[PDB]
Every structure is written in C-alpha cells, then in structure tokens.
mmCIF file of N, CA and C in Angstrom:
data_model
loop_
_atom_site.group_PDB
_atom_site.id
_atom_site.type_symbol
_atom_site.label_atom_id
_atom_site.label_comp_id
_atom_site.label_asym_id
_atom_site.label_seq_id
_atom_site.Cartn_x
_atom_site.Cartn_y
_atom_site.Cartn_z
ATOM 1 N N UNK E 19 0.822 -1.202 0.000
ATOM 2 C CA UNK E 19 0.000 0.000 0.000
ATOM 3 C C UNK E 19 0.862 1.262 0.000
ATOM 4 N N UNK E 20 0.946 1.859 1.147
ATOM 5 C CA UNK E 20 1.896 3.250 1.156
ATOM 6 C C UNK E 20 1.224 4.301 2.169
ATOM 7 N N UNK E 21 1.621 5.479 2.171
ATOM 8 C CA UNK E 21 0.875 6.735 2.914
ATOM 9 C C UNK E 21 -0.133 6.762 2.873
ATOM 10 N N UNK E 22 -0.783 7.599 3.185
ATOM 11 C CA UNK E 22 -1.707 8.489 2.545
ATOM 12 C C UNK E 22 -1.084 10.155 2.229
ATOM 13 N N UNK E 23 -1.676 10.834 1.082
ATOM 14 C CA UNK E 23 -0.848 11.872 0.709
ATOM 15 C C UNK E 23 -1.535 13.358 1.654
ATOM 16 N N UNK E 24 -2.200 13.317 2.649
ATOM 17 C CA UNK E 24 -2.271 13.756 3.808
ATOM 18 C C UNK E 24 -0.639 13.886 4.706
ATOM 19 N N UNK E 25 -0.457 12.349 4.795
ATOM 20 C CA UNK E 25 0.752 12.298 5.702
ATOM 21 C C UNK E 25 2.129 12.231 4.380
ATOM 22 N N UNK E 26 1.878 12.653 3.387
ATOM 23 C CA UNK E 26 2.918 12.613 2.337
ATOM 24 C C UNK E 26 3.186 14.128 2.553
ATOM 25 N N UNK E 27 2.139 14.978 2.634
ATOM 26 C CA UNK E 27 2.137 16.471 2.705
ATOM 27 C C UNK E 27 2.647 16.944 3.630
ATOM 28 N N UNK E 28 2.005 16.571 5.134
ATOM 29 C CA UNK E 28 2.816 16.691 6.329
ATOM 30 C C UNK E 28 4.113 16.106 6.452
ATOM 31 N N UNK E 29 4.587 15.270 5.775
ATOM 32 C CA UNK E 29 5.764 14.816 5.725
ATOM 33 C C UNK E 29 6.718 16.568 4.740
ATOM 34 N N UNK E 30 5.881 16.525 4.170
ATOM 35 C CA UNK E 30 6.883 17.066 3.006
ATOM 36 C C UNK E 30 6.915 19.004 3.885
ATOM 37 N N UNK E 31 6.080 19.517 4.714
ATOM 38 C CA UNK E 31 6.254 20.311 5.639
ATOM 39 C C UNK E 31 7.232 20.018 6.485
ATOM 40 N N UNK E 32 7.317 18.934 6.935
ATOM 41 C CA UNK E 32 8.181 18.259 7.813
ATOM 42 C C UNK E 32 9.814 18.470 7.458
ATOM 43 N N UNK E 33 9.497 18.404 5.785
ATOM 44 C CA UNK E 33 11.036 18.393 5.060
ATOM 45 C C UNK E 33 11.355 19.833 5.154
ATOM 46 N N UNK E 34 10.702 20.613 4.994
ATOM 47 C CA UNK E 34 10.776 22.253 5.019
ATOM 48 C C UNK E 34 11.197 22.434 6.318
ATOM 49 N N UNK E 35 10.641 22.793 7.616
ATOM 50 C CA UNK E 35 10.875 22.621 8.695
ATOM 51 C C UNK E 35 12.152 21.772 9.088
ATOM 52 N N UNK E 36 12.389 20.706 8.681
ATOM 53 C CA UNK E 36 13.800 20.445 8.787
ATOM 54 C C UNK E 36 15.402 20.568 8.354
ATOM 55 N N UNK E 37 14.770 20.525 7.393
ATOM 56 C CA UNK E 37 16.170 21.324 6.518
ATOM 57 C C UNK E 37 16.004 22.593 6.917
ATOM 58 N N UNK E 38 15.444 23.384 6.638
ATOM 59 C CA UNK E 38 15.828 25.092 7.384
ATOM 60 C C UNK E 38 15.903 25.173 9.105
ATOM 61 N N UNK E 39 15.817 24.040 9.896
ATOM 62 C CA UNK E 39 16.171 23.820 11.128
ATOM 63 C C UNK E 39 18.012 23.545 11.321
ATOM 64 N N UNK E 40 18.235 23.010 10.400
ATOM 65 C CA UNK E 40 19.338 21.759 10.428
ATOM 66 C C UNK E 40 20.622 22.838 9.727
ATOM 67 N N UNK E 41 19.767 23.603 8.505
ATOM 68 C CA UNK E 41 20.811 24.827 7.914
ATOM 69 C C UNK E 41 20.964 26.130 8.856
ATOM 70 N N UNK E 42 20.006 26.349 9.664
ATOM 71 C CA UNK E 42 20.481 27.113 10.838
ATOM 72 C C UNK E 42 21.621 26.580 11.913
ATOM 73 N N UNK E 43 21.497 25.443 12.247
ATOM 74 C CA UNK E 43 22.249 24.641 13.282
ATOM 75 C C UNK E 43 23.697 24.707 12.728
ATOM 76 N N UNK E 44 23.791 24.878 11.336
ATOM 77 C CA UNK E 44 25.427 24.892 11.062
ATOM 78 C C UNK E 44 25.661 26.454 10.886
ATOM 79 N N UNK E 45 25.898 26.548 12.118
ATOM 80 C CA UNK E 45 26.608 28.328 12.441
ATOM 81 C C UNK E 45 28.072 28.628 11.433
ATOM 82 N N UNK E 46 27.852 29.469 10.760
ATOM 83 C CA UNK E 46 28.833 30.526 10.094
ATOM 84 C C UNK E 46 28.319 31.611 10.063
ATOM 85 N N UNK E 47 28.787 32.441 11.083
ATOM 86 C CA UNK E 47 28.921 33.916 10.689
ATOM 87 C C UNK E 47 30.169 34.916 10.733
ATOM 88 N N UNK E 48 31.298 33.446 10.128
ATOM 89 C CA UNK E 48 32.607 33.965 9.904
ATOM 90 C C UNK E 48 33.488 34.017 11.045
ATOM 91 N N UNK E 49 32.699 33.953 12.193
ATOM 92 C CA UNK E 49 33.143 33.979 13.738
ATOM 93 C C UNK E 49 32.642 33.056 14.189
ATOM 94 N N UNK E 50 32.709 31.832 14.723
ATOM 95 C CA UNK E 50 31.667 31.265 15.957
ATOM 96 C C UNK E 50 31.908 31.532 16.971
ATOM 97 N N UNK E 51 33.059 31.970 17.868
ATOM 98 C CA UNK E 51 33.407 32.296 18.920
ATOM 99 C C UNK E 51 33.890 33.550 19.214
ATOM 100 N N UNK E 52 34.029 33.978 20.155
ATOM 101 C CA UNK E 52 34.692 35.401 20.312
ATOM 102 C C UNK E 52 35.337 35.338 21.601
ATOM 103 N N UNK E 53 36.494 34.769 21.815
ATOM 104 C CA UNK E 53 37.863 35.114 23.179
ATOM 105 C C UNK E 53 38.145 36.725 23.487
ATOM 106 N N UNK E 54 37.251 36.625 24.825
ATOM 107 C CA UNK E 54 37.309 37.956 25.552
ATOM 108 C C UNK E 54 38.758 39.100 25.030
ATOM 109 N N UNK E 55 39.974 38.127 25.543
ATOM 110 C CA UNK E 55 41.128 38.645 25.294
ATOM 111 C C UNK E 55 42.171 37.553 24.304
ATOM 112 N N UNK F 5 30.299 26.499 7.642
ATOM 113 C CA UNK F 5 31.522 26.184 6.516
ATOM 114 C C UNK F 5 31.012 24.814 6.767
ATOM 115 N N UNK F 6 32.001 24.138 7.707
ATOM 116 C CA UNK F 6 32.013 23.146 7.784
ATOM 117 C C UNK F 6 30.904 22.579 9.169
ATOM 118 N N UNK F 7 31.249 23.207 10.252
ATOM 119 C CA UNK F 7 31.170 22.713 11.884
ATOM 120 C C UNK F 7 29.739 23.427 12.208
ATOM 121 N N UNK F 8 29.070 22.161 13.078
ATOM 122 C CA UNK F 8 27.815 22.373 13.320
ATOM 123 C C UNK F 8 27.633 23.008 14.783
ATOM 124 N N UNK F 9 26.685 23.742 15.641
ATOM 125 C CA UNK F 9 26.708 24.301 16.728
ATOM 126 C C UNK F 9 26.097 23.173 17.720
ATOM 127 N N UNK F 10 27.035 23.231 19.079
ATOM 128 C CA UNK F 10 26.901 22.327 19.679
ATOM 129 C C UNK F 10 25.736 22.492 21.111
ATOM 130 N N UNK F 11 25.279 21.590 21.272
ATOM 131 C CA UNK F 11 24.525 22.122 22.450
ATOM 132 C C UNK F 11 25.126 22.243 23.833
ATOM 133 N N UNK F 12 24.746 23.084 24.548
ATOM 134 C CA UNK F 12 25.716 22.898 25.889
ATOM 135 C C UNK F 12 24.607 23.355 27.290
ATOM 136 N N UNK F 13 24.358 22.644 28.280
ATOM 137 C CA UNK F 13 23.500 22.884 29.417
ATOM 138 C C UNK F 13 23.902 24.158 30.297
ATOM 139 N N UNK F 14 24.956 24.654 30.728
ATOM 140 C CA UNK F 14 25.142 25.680 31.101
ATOM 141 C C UNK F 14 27.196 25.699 31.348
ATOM 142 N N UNK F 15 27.774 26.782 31.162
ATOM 143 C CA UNK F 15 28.906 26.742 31.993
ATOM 144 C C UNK F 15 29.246 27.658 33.058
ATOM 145 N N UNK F 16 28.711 29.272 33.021
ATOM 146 C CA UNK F 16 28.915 30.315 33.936
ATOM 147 C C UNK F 16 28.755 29.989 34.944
ATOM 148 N N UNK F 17 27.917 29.281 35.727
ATOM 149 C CA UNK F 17 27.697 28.747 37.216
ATOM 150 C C UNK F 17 28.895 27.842 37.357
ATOM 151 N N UNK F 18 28.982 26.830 37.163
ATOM 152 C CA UNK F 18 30.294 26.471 37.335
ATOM 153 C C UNK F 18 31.690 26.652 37.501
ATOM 154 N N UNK F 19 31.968 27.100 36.674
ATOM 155 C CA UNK F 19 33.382 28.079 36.401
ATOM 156 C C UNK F 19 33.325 28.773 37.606
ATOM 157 N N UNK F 20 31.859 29.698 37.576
ATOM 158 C CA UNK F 20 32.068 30.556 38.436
ATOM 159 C C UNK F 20 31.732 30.048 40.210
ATOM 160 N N UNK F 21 31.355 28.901 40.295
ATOM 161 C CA UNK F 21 31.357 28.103 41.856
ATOM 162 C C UNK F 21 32.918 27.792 41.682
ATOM 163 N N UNK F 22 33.434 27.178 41.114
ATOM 164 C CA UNK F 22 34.866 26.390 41.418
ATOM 165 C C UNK F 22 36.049 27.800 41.713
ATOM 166 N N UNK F 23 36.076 28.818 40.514
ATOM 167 C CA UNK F 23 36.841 29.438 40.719
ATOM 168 C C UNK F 23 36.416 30.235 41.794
ATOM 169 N N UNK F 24 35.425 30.399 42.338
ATOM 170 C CA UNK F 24 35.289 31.201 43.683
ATOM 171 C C UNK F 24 35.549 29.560 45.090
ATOM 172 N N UNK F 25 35.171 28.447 45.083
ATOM 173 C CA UNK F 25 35.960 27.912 45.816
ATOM 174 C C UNK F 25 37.536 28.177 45.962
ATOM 175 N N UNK F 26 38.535 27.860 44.646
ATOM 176 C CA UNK F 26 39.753 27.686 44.826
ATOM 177 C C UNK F 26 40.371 29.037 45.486
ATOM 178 N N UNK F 27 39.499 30.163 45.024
ATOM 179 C CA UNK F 27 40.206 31.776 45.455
ATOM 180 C C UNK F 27 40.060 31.826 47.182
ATOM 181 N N UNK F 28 38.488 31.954 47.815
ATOM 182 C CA UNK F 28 38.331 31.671 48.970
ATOM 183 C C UNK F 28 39.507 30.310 49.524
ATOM 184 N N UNK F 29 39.564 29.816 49.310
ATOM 185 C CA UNK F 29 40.551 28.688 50.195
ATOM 186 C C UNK F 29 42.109 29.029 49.952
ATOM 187 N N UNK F 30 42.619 29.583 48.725
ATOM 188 C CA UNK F 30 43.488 30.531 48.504
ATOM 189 C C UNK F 30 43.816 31.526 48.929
ATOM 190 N N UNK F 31 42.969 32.409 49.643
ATOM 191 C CA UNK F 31 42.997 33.904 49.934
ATOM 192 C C UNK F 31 44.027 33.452 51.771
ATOM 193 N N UNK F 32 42.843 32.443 52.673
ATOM 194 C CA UNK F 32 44.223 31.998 53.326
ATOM 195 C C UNK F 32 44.582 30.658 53.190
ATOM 196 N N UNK F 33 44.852 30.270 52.048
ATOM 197 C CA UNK F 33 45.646 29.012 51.597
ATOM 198 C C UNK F 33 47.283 29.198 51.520
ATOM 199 N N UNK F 34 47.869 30.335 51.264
ATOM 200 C CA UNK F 34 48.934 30.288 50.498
ATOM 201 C C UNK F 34 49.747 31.466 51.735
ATOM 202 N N UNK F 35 49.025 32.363 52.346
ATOM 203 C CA UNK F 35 49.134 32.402 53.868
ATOM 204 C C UNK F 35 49.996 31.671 55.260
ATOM 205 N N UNK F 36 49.001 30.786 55.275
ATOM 206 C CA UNK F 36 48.575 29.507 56.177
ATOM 207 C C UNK F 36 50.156 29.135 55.754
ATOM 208 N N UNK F 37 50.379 28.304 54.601
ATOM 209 C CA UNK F 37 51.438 27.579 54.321
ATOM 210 C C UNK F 37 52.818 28.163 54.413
ATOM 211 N N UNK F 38 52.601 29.531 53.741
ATOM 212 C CA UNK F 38 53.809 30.573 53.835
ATOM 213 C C UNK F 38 54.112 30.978 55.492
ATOM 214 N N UNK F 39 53.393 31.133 56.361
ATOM 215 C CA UNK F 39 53.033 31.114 57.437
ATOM 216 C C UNK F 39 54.143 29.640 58.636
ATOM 217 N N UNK F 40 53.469 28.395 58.016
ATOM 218 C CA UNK F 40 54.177 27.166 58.502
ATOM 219 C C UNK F 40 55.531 26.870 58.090
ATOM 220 N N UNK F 41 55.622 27.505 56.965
ATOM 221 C CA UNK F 41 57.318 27.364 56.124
ATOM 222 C C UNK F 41 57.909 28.216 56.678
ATOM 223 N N UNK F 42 57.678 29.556 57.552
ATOM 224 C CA UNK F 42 58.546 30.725 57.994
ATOM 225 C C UNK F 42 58.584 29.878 59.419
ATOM 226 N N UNK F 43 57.808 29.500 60.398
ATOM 227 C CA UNK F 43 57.773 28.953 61.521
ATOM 228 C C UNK F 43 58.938 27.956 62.091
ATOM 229 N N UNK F 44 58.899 27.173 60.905
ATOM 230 C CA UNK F 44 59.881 25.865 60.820
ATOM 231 C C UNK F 44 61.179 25.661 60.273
ATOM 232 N N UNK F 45 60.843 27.279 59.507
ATOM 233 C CA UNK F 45 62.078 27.435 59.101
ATOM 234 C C UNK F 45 63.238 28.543 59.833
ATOM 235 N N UNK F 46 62.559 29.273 60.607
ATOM 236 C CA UNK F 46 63.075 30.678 60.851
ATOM 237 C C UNK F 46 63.154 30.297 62.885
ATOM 238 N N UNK F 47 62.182 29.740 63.589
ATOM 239 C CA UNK F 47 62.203 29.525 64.931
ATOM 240 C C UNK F 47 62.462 28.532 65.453
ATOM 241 N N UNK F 48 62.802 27.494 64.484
ATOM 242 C CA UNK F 48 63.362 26.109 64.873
ATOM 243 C C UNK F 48 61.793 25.434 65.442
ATOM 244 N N UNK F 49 62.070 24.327 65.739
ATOM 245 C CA UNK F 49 61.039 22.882 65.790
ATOM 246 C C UNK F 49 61.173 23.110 67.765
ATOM 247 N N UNK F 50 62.355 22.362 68.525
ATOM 248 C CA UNK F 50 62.874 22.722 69.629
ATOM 249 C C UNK F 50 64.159 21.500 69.285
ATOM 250 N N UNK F 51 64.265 21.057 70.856
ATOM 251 C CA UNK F 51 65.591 20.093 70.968
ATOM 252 C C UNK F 51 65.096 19.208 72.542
ATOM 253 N N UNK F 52 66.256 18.575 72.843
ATOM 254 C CA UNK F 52 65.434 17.111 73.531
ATOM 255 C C UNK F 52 66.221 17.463 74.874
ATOM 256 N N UNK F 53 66.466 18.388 75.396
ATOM 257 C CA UNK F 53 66.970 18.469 77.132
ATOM 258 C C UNK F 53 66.029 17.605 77.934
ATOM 259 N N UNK F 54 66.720 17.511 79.279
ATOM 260 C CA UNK F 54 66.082 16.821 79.871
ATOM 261 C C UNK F 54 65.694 17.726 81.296
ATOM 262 N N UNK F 55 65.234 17.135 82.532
ATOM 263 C CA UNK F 55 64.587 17.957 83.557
ATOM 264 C C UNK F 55 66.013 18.471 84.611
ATOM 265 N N UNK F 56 65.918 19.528 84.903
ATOM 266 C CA UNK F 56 67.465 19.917 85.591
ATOM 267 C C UNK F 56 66.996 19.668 87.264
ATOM 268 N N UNK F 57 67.916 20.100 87.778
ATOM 269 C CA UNK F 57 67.947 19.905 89.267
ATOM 270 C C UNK F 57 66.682 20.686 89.845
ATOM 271 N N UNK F 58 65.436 20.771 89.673
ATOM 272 C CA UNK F 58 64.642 21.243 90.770
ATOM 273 C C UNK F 58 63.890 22.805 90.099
ATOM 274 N N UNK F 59 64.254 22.637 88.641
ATOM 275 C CA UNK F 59 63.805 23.561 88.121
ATOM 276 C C UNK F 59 62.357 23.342 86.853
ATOM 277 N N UNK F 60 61.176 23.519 87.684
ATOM 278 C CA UNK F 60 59.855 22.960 87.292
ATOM 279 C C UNK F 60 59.091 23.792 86.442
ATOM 280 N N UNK F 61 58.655 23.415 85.258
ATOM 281 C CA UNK F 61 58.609 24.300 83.872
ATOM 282 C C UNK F 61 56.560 24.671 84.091
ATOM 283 N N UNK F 62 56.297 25.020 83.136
ATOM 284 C CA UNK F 62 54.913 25.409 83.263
ATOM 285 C C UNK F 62 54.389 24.123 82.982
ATOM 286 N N UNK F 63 52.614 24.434 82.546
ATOM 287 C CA UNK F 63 52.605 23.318 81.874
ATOM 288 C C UNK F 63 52.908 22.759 80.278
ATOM 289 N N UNK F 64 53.286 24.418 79.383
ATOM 290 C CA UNK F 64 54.032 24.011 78.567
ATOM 291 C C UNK F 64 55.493 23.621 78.532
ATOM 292 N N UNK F 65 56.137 23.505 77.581
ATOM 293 C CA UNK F 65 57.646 23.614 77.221
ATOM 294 C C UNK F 65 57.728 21.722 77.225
ATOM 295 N N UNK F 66 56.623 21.423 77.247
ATOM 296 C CA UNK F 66 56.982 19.705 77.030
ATOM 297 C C UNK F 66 56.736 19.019 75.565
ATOM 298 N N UNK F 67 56.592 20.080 74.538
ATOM 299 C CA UNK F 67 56.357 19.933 73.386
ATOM 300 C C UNK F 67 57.124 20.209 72.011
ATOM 301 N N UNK F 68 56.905 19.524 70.762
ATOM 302 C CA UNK F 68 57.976 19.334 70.017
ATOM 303 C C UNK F 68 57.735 20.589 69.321
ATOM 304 N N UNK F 69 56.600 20.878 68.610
ATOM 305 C CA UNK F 69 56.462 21.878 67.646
ATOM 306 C C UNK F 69 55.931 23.247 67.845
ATOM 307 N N UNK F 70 56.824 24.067 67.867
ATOM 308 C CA UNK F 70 56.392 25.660 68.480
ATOM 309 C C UNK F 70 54.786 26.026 68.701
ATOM 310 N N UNK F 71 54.625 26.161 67.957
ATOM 311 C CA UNK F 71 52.891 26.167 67.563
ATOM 312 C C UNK F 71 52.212 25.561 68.694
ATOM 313 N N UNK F 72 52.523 24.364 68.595
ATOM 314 C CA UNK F 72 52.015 23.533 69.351
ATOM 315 C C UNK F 72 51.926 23.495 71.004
#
C-alpha cells in the first residue's frame, strides 16, 4: 500500500521545517566564537 | 563552513562556583602555608633536654612543635 498523501504532505512540511532547522544549526557567521582577550 | 553548533546545558555557574571555591581557600591558603614554612624554618622545631635539678617548667615547654 503506502501513505496516505495527507501524511505525504505533512511529511513534506516536515522536510521544510527540517532542513531550514538543520541549515540554521550549522553556524557561520565567519566567527563562531569570540575570546574575551 | 564546515562545523555544526553544539549544544551545551550551562557553563557560567560552574566556572564561576569552582573558581570562587579555589580563590576563597586561597585567599588563606597560600598564607597559612607561607606562614608554617617561615615557623619551621626561621624559629626552629625545639631540641630534647632533659629535667634539671629542681627547676619545674609550666605546663608548657613539654612539646615538640612551636605552635604547638
């Protein structure tokens, strides 16, 4: 059988929501850290 | 680039309990010791005489280590 394309859809939100979760989580903003001194 | 951000539960409390333990026990830690190293080094420990003819001490002076 398979899904239903209900839970194919919510899946595929799911994919949105995760990948732009997962591309935030890999920090570059040229700096990740900053040593006081 | 490459490296992902890591999760971490807290560190400022920590750091900041330990390094305020080691300073407090430091402040007279290093004192205290500098203190016992001048004592033992500078007034002597004593020496082992024995009781003279009729001459009766307090109740100190029967002891090894100044301080003490």
């Amino acid at each position: 059988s398979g899904y239903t394309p209900d839970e194919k859809l919510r899946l595929q939100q799911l994919r949105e929501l995760r990948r732009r979760w997962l591309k935030d989580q890999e920090l570059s903003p040229r700096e990740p850290v900053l040593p006081p001194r | 680039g490459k490296r992902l951000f890591i999760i971490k539960p807290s560190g400022f409390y920590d750091k900041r309990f330990l390094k305020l333990l080691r300073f407090y026990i430091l402040l007279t830690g290093i004192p205290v010791v500098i203190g016992i190293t001048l004592i033992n080094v500078f007034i002597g420990e004593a020496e082992l005489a024995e009781i003279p003819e009729g001459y009766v001490p307090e109740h100190w002076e029967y002891f090894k280590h100044p301080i003490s």
